[PDB]
Paper text:
N-terminal sequencing and subsequent cDNA cloning of this toxin revealed that each peptide chain of αD-[name] comprises 50 amino acid residues sharing high sequence homology with other known αD-conotoxins. Our electrophysiology data showed that αD-[name] has strong inhibitory activity on α9α10, α7 and α3β2 subtypes, moderate inhibitory activity on α3β4 and α1β1δε subtypes, and weak activity on α4β2 and α4β4 subtypes. In summary, by resolving the crystal structure and performing structure-guided dissection of a dimeric conotoxin αD-[name], we demonstrate that αD-conotoxins inhibit nAChR most likely by binding of the two CTDs cooperatively to two inter-subunit interfaces on the top surface of nAChR.
There is one conotoxin homodimer with a pseudo two-fold symmetry per asymmetric unit. Each peptide chain consists of an N-terminal domain (NTD, residues 1–20) and a C-terminal domain (CTD, residues 21–50). The NTD comprises an N-terminal loop and a β-strand, and the CTD assumes several extended loop conformations. The dimerization involves mainly the N-terminal loops and β-strands of the NTDs, which is further stabilized by two inter-chain disulfide bonds between Cys6 of one chain and Cys18 of the other. There are three disulfide bonds (Cys24-Cys36, Cys29-Cys46 and Cys34-Cys48) in the CTD, making the CTD adopt a compact structure. Interestingly, the CTD of αD-[name] adopts a canonical inhibitory cystine knot (ICK) disulfide linkage, as observed in many 6-Cys-residue-containing bioactive peptides, including several families of conotoxins. On the other hand, the length of αD-[name] (up to 52.4 Å between the Cα atoms of the two C-terminal Met50 residues) makes it unlikely that αD-[name] binds in the nAChR central pore or on the outside-facing surface of the pentameric extracellular domains.
Numbering used by the authors:
A (entry chain B): 3 to 39, 42 to 50
B (entry chain A): 2 to 50
Amino acid sequence: HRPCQSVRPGRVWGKCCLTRLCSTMCCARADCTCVYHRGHGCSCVM
Amino acid sequence: VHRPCQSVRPGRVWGKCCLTRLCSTMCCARADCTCVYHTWRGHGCSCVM
């Protein structure tokens, strides 16, 4: 349902972004989409 | 991997996810564990030690 990323080698719990993941960036809110080019980032409702 | 993403606390955009296998609430030691039901103790994992 979302990418699950490893935290430490060995740990069974990873981390995941609850809102929107834009490359490596987890957006502040769910109502954000991704922009890429500045730099990659989140575009969110004003 | 791709997994269900559980919230840890309000306001936080990063949640947690079980990289192995989830047996209801329990994240198992290994991806190859399977889920059991223990009478009086509930859902759990059974794993190759």
